Amino acid sequence: QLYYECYSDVSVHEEMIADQVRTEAYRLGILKNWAALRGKTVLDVGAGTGILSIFCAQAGARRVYAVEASAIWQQAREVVRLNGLEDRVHVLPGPVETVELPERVDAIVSEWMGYGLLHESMLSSVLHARTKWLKEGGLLLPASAELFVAPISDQMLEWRLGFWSQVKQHYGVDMSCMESFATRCLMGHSEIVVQDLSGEDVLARPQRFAQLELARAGLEQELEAGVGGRFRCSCYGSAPLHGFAVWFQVTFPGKPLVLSTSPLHPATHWKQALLYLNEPVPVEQDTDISGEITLLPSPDNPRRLRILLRYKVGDHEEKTKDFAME
Amino acid sequence: QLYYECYSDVSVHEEMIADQVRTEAYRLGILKNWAALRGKTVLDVGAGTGILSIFCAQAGARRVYAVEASAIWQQAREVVRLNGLEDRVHVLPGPVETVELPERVDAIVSEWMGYGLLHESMLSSVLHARTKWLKEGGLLLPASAELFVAPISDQMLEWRLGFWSQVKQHYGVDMSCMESFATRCLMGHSEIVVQDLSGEDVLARPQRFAQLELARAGLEQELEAGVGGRFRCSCYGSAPLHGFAVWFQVTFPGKPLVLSTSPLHPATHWKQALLYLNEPVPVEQDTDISGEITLLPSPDNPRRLRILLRYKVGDHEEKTKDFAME
Ligand SMILES: [Mg+2]
Ligand SMILES: [Mg+2]
């Protein structure tokens, strides 16, 4: 009959496990590496409720170290025991940067990805653990990530902006002047917005603007300096351009299994990271759009994602907008 | 190209106007009082974007004073002008408690209702304005409110709690121990939760536990002391009892038009106010439930809704739970 403060805690973990695209991609990606994991030792970075660590045991791992800093580590220990794996899977509380493992490991598994790939992500902790605890020639799951961008005409946003001009049709009162107000409020800000889109929102072929091989020399320094690159595309047809969507995929080594968060693919809890222009720009078929996207740490907090956008639409002058996570 | 901070502002007003049940009930409720409003003066308390004030003009009012304290009053003035009513409808910024009208009024219209009827509601301001500005024999729209309660088995909550015991069926990992954790987090707190339900969630005949005639002597004092009353009901069948839902209706004088927020009726943006027990209680057909519900000001803030619940399920001892708005 006591009162507890853990609603967010359960909601977050519920969302992740109920994300079948995510959870089944990890289950299968781990099983696909059975030959490399059989009789070997694994470190799970940010193990949460422990389900990926148990998948590793089920793929044949001799021993798994499940490291989790948040309050939820306690529930992981109970889940391990319930599945009869308390002698194979060891739950260790606290950050992986200072945990003491009794041995180096053959593999690191982690669901480290955040909104826009790098918002409040565990990637820096995975790389720290790779340097400190992974044996030479050891395995990282997933092994790589790719970043994508596309111009968008967000159909839900279009409806919200146009709503005010439609009030007269429904109630006999003209409220069309509310449209400029709504545009300022919904687009005239510099926050990254997390929202799920579909193919109906995508205005040109998506462009890959970066590829991250997670084991590669120098990646820690690239993350600090900024990850990204240039892009170019041509519009499919006539629409209000609202800005750009950014998303990612990750790949599990083997034919490789890919977990995608594209709006063209099955929805996931990551959705997409939307970068709105200050106001809509009309485009037509074959309107050329080019630009550059850079994912950066925020200066107050390297864990909060910043995105610097440069973009040029048709014959308009190149523009810049500097975003930070909502 | 400047940045503005008004997302919440537009979202709130969008939600209200897009609530067709709400907006059409006010449009029709106002029109239904055409004979009383024709050639008369009206005060709109908390006029927001101004749409109800314009409805009053369209119902024949000679003059309407639209009083609004928040930033949105500016958009109301533009809406009035756009509909060509700047000489009939006057928008006045600031709280109605200190506004200076050039005359007393024949009627007060207001959409004052909050979540659980009284959370951050404008009712005290409507009653203040009634005392200060309404002529003798003057009209209030709506004229009355009624409060309802029913026991509930929240099907969405039931699914969330049971989710953890279903993980084994889908991924081959037992997580059933997460259920007690989820119950503590989702039910073991004393916050009122705003959530929309349907008939599938309602476990016994809804009970009216209070009626408020808005013009009645003594209502201001009743609001301070607490509004509510006792109830009794008998369960329809076998289910986990999760607690109680509270909702309201308001009535426009004329056959009277009723705007309801019942889960048995068309959904509205008010949804219902849910009062969860600390954990589910099993009930059966004809299980008797009795109790008392009181809606109160919070001590820090009379505008934040508090609800004191007393309840007795079957042969169990009577219990008390003291809730405050989330
Ligand atoms: Mg996550
Ligand atoms: Mg309201």
Swiss-Prot record, chains A, B:
It is found in: Nucleus. Arginine methyltransferase that can catalyze the formation of both omega-N monomethylarginine (MMA) and asymmetrical dimethylarginine (aDMA), with a strong preference for the formation of aDMA. Preferentially methylates arginyl residues present in a glycine and arginine-rich domain and displays preference for monomethylated substrates. Specifically mediates the asymmetric dimethylation of histone H3 'Arg-2' to form H3R2me2a. H3R2me2a represents a specific tag for epigenetic transcriptional repression and is mutually exclusive with methylation on histone H3 'Lys-4' (H3K4me2 and H3K4me3). One of its GO terms (molecular function) is protein-arginine omega-N asymmetric methyltransferase activity. GO terms for biological process: cellular senescence; DNA repair; methylation; negative regulation of DNA-templated transcription; negative regulation of transcription by RNA polymerase II; negative regulation of ubiquitin-dependent protein catabolic process; protein modification process; regulation of mitochondrion organization. Automethylation enhances its stability. The keyword Cell membrane does not apply. Its EC number is 2.1.1.319. The keyword S-adenosyl-L-methionine applies. Belongs to the class I-like SAM-binding methyltransferase superfamily. Protein arginine N-methyltransferase family. PRMT6 subfamily. This is Protein arginine N-methyltransferase 6. Residues 1-326 form the SAM-dependent MTase PRMT-type domain. Disruption phenotype: Embryonic fibroblasts from mutant mice display growth defects, premature senescence and increased levels of TP53 and multiple TP53 targets. In liver, knockdown disrupts the formation of a cAMP-mediated transcription complex involving CRTC2, reduces the expression of genes encoding gluconeogenic factors and decreases glucose output in primary hepatocytes, it also restores euglycemia in insulin-resistant mice. The lineage of its organism: Eukaryota, Metazoa, Chordata, Craniata, Vertebrata. It catalyses: L-arginyl-[protein] + 2 S-adenosyl-L-methionine = N(omega),N(omega)-dimethyl-L-arginyl-[protein] + 2 S-adenosyl-L-homocysteine + 2 H(+). S-adenosyl-L-methionine binds at residues 13, 22, 46, 68, 97. Keywords: Chromatin regulator, DNA damage, DNA repair, Methylation, Methyltransferase, Nucleus, Repressor, S-adenosyl-L-methionine, Transcription, Transcription regulation, Transferase. CDD domains: AdoMet_MTases.
